[PDB]
Amino acid sequence: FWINKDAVPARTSLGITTVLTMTTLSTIARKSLPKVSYVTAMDLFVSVCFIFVFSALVEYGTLHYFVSNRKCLDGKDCASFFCCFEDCHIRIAKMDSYARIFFPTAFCLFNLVYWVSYLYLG
């Protein structure tokens, strides 16, 4: 996310390589068990990590596409009070700006919930 938008091969390489690394990590993590047909905690953690990196990759893909290839109620109005529509392009170019804090704090929240769930009640 901190690389420039125009460095297309670099960011594409980062995303694709990270998903390959997640697949390899999943395989070498799951080969340390019998061939059981249910999920485990490590499989869940690896799945969530894969989801995070895939979300980053598709985020960059969306950014590149939208930047390069394209341009009664006490409340006085019912839609504004209980809905929303004022154009919500607006700030799609800003996606990398606030994506630098969305993903890390999402990951921190997931780690907190995951570890608190297993290490205490299990």
Partner: peptide, 9 residues
Amino acid sequence: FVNYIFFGR
């Protein structure tokens, strides 16, 4: 970091 500050914003 250097690519961010000296080639990007």
